[PDB]
Amino acid sequence: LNEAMNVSCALLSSGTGPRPISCTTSTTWSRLQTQDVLMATCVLENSSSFSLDQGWTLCIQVLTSSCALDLDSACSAITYTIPVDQLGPGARREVTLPLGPGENGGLDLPVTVSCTLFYSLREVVGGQEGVCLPLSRHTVDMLQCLRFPGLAPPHTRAPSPLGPTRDPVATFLETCRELPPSVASIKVSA
Amino acid sequence: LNEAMNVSCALLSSGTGPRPISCTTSTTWSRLQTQDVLMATCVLENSSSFSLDQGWT
Amino acid sequence: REVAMTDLCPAGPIQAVEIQVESSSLADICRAHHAVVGRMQTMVTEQATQGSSAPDLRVQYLRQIHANHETLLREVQTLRDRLCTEDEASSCATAQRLLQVYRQLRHPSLILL
Amino acid sequence: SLLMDQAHDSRFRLLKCQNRVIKLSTNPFKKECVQIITAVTSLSPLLTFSKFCCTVLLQIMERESGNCPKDRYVVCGRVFLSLEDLSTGKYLLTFPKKKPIEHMEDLFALLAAFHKSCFQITSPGYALNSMKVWLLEHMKCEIIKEFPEVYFCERPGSFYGTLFTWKQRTPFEGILIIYSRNQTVMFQCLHNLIRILPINCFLKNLKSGSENFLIDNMAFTLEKELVTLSSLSSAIAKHESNKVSGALYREITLKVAEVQLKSDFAAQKLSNL
Amino acid sequence: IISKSYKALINLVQSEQLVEKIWYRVIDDSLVVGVKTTSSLKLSLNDVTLSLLMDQAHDSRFRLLKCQNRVIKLSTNPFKKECVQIITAVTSLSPLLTFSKFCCTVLLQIMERESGNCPKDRYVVCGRVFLSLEDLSTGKYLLTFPKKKPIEHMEDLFALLAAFHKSCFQITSPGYALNSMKVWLLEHMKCE
């Protein structure tokens, strides 16, 4: 518990740039069999000496789109909970967890990754309860999801993706039952 | 069909260089959730003129 | 690119930087608009408490913008009243027209100066 | 989310949980509705010490506030599970025989564990009641009394244990939701449903909400945006009586942007369908 | 002339039935396809695989399609006496019922191991499998549990040995004997 309090004090106070603990989030494009998918590297780093022993965990939660809609969709969010193993001073670990279009093109995009820590004493010994420290709220824009295949460095012959044709359930519905470019702009003072 | 027969014959022939159609594979490492995974990229490259239109898989 | 407009500002237009986005998909425009606007919100609220403010004309063009916005406002309100009554053609031309209003609104949206 | 006990698992691997929210109206025919949250997960990676303990952490985050101010974490009790516990039932829902659903946690464990798919139905030039026959005579449904908007098909064929719901708003149009144990059954079901309907009955899949509701959303978003821009111009127009403070223009453009992001959200929802 | 040249293509690359016959079942959301061999094909000497290939005529689009291959040996009344090697593949259905229907083709591939020339790859196209939703809606290919206990098409049994997850345990009692197993199996587990 002493270690936990020094750590919590380090984290919450000292409103500076370098925190003792950090969690940088990148984004990346990977191939899954043939598909493209979006990936989130979450990288937890420990710049301090505090080897965060047992009863620390790492709670990531990924909300796809935050708005109230009537019909209730199958995945508001997804959550992960890796146990952290003392983590050690100066160390860092990396966690790739994909976000990608899990449906046929089914991808609404303000998807947000958030990382949190959680400490429970009841784990080591009780006497219960616990404490949730919030670390990062990262967001993923659409400016991140662009990949520019043509201007890309390699200039290599990749097939064009041409995402799935309307829905494999759409196809089902057609068979079983048988333009200008849109633009937007802003101006702003130099 | 003709194109097919020409491709077929080219692949069984020995050109002394296997270059009607080639396929390299190459091993890498990626990351999934927690564990490193081992992935094989299989690249299909067309060197010769022959177009594999519908019917090939 | 840069696009200077003198009939908006009194003396200094600014040779203002415009940002355009173009695509086949209107939905991806909704998204990259959401994103650009969000980052211009970020920039404006980040630059405020440091930056100054230009003077405006007060006249002619803010009122023209009021009028061309008000016509769309009253039209969408009439469309809302029609969707409340639910007489006939429940919702087909309604969505296409609402998106026509959206397209009309979006193109010069929020010139921040 | 679900946290395993570290002292148990010396080896660190990941954990997953899909959050499905479930709104069910209770006797709408105020009148109590029921919102319940639910997570779902794989067993067999946890049972590798015959017994496991998991804490249950319920976060709440605000949308309105862009300051990330409010993170009201909660710790909602603690679950223990052992292989002796399973050996004697005690927690399982296993089909046939435990049919008469009279512990609504049984219903909810269904609605959560089952793949969900929503469909709007329209019959423009024909009133629509043949759904209630396809349901009540063909599929041989059982209505759950506590929640009379949910139908559990008992027909002992291949689609045994599939749940519907059916909101018949404006009796031309309706909306039907299919909870199933895989996607083969969901296709086996759609086929049988299309077979019964009229020739003109136009189905449609729904990703992200009902067309009427998303139009109302788009309408609302445009209305607020246009009202706010009229407010900008009225702020200028009273300043016309009083050359303008660029500070005011900036202050108002911020709120206009904050509403525009919502109109662009409603617009993408409308413009994908 | 087109026919003539098909047959000419076929004969240009290239008698004894290396394969009996094809069968397929649907378990829940999986498709399992299996094929029963003959004496000539000796799995001691030849690794064999199988694949399923969709007709691109239907598939206007291209996903991959994946298949896992088991070999299943069962001895027939060891209590000469016939072994039975069959070779089987398992895949997802729901990716393939996009068009209410489909027609895969089954390809048994063979690679020898001793000869480092990579010499003898006797491909063989063993039948051709059609499914449709109209068929499953009338059962006819499904395997559905209980009451459908008395398994009298042995393919249905080879499907569960192909679709289901397999684990093999060695038991060693250093200090008793082991006759409890059949009792556990027959009384506690009530096995036929």
Q: DSSP string spanning D35-48?
A: EEEE----STTTGG
* Rg, Å, chain B Cα set: 16
Name every chain E residue with its beta carbon within 8 A of the beta carbon of B57. 53, 56
Specify whether the backbone of C41 is left (phi greater than 0), alpha (psi in -120 to 50) or beta. alpha
Q: For residues A4 and A53, what is the distance between their CA atoms, to the nearest angstrom?
A: 9
Rounded alpha-carbon distances, angstroms, from residue E107 to A77, C94, D117, E137: 42, 54, 35, 27
Size of interface A-B (CB pairs under 8 A): 13
Which runs of E-coded beta strand occur in chain C? Answer: 17-23
Closest CA to D6 of A55, A81, A117: A55
Q: For residues E34 and C30, what is the distance between their CA atoms, to the nearest angstrom?
A: 50
Q: What count of residues does chain A have?
A: 190
Looking at CA atoms only, how far is residue B5 from chain E in angstroms? Answer: 7
How was this structure determined? It was done by cryo-EM
In this complex, is the C-beta atom of A174 within 8 Å of any C-beta atom belonging to chain C? Answer: no
Q: Is C in contact with E (3 or more beta carbon pairs below 8 Å)?
A: no
* Burial (Cβ within 10 Å: 0-12, 13-18, ≥19) of residue A152: exposed
Name every chain B residue with its beta carbon within 8 A of the beta carbon of A94. 31
Confirm if D180 and D115 have CB atoms less than 8 A apart. yes
CB within 8 Å: E61 and A164: yes
Query: Degrees (nearest 5) of the Cα angle E122, E125, E127?
Result: 150
Name every chain B residue with its beta carbon within 8 A of the beta carbon of A30. 30
In this complex, is the C-beta atom of B9 within 8 Å of any C-beta atom belonging to chain E? Answer: yes
Tell me which chains share at least 3 CB pairs under 8 Å with chain E. Answer: A, B, D
Task: Determine the residue among B28, B33, B45 to mutate to test chain A binding: the one whose Cβ has the most chain A Cβ atoms within 10 Å.
Answer: B33
In this complex, is the C-beta atom of E100 within 8 Å of any C-beta atom belonging to chain D? Answer: yes
Q: Which tokens hold the place of C67?
A: 């009028």
Confirm if B16 and B45 have CB atoms less than 8 A apart. no
**Would you tell me the crossing angle of helices D211-241 and C61-85 to the nearest 10 degrees?**
150
DSSP conformation class of B40: E
Name every chain A residue with its beta carbon within 8 A of the beta carbon of B32. 96, 98
Q: What residue in D sits closest to E96 (Cα-Cα)?
A: D184
Name every chain E residue with its beta carbon within 8 A of the beta carbon of B4. 9
CB within 8 Å: D226 and C37: no
**Pick from B9, B12, B57: CB nearest E56:** B57
**Pick from E63, E66, E100: CB nearest A175:** E100
Q: For residues A117 and A57, what is the distance between their CA atoms, to the nearest angstrom?
A: 6
Q: What is the DSSP annotation of E106-122? A: EEEEEEESS-TT-----
Q: Which tokens hold the place of B54?
A: 């519908």
Q: Which tokens hold the place of A59?
A: 């709670």
Q: For residues D254 and D226, what is the distance between their CA atoms, to the nearest angstrom?
A: 14
Tell me which chains share at least 3 CB pairs under 8 Å with chain A. Answer: B, C, D, E
Name every chain B residue with its beta carbon within 8 A of the beta carbon of A57. none
* Burial (Cβ within 10 Å: 0-12, 13-18, ≥19) of residue E178: exposed
CB within 8 Å: E28 and D188: no
Closest CA to C63 of D230, A83, E132: D230
Q: For residues C24 and D264, what is the distance between their CA atoms, to the nearest angstrom?
A: 16
Q: Is B in contact with D (3 or more beta carbon pairs below 8 Å)?
A: yes
CB within 8 Å: D265 and A67: yes
Residue B10: helix, strand or coil by DSSP? Answer: helix
CB within 8 Å: B57 and E2: no
Rounded alpha-carbon distances, angstroms, from residue A153 to A149, A178, B44: 9, 46, 21
The A residues from 65 to 124 touching B (CB cutoff 8 Å) are: 80, 82, 94-98
Q: For residues A149 and A154, what is the distance between their CA atoms, to the nearest angstrom?
A: 9
CB within 8 Å: A103 and D9: no
In the block, tokens 């991140």 appear at A144
Looking at CA atoms only, how far is residue A97 from chain B in angstroms? Answer: 5
Residue E146: CB atoms within 10 Å: 6
Strand partners, C25: none
Closest CA to D134 of D121, D115, D117: D121
Q: What residue in E sits closest to D195 (Cα-Cα)?
A: E134
Strand partners, D136: none
Q: What count of residues does chain C have?
A: 113
CB within 8 Å: A34 and E99: no
Our measurement of the distance from residue C10's CA atom to the centroid of its chain's CA atoms, rounded to an integer in Å, reads 22
**Pick from A61, A81, A106: CB nearest D3:** A81
Q: For residues D109 and E82, what is the distance between their CA atoms, to the nearest angstrom?
A: 49
Name the phi and psi angles at C94, rounded to 5: -60, -50
Rounded alpha-carbon distances, angstroms, from residue E81 to E41, E84, E157, E185: 17, 10, 20, 26
Q: For residues C5 and C15, what is the distance between their CA atoms, to the nearest angstrom?
A: 7
**Alpha helix segments (H runs only) across E14-136:** 133-136
Closest CA to A53 of A4, A126, A122, A95: A4
Q: Under an 8 Å CB criterion, which residues of B touch D?
A: 33-35
CB within 8 Å: B8 and E5: no
Specify whether the backbone of E77 is left (phi greater than 0), alpha (psi in -120 to 50) or beta. left
Q: For chain E, percent helix, then strand, then coil, each to nearest 5?
A: 20, 35, 50
Closest CA to C53 of C87, C9, C84: C9
Closest CA to D195 of D116, D118, D130: D130
Name every chain C residue with its beta carbon within 8 A of the beta carbon of A181. 22-24
Report which secondary-structure segment, H or E, holds E156. helix E154-163
Q: For residues E108 and E48, what is the distance between their CA atoms, to the nearest angstrom?
A: 7
CB within 8 Å: E94 and D191: no
Report which secondary-structure segment, H or E, holds C39. helix C26-47
Confirm if A118 and D57 have CB atoms less than 8 A apart. yes
Q: What count of residues does chain D have?
A: 273
b/e map of A85-109 (b: 16 or more CB within 10 Å)? Answer: bebeeeeebebbbbbebeebebbbb
CB within 8 Å: A171 and E99: yes
Closest CA to A31 of A119, A100, A113, A115: A100
In the block, tokens 């798919």 appear at D117
Amino acid at E68: Q
Q: For residues A117 and A26, what is the distance between their CA atoms, to the nearest angstrom?
A: 19
**Pick from A71, A78, A130: CB nearest D75:** A130
CB within 8 Å: C62 and D247: no
Closest CA to A141 of C18, D217, C33, D245: C33
Q: For residues B9 and D215, what is the distance between their CA atoms, to the nearest angstrom?
A: 61
Mention every residue, 6+ apart, whose C-beta is less than 8 A from residue A156: none
b/e map of E152-172 (b: 16 or more CB within 10 Å)? Answer: eeebeebbeebbeeeeeeeee
Q: For residues A145 and A28, what is the distance between their CA atoms, to the nearest angstrom?
A: 8
Q: For residues D233 and A46, what is the distance between their CA atoms, to the nearest angstrom?
A: 52
Closest CA to D57 of A60, A8, A64, A53: A60
Confirm if A124 and A80 have CB atoms less than 8 A apart. no
Q: For residues B22 and B11, what is the distance between their CA atoms, to the nearest angstrom?
A: 10
Report which secondary-structure segment, H or E, holds C76. helix C61-85
Strand partners, E124: E108
Looking at CA atoms only, how far is residue A168 from chain E in angstroms? Answer: 5
Amino acid at D137: E
Q: Which tokens hold the place of D269?
A: 């929802």
Amino acid at E50: L
* Rg, Å, chain D Cα set: 25
Name every chain D residue with its beta carbon within 8 A of the beta carbon of B33. 13-14
CB within 8 Å: D14 and A80: yes
Confirm if D70 and D82 have CB atoms less than 8 A apart. no
CB within 8 Å: C90 and D222: no
Report which secondary-structure segment, H or E, holds C98. helix C93-106
Q: What residue in D sits closest to B35 (Cα-Cα)?
A: D13
Report which secondary-structure segment, H or E, holds E32. strand E30-37
DSSP conformation class of E44: T
**Pick from D157, D184, D191: CB nearest E29:** D184
Size of interface A-E (CB pairs under 8 A): 20
Query: Degrees (nearest 5) of the Cα angle E40, E42, E48?
Result: 110
CB within 8 Å: B1 and E6: yes
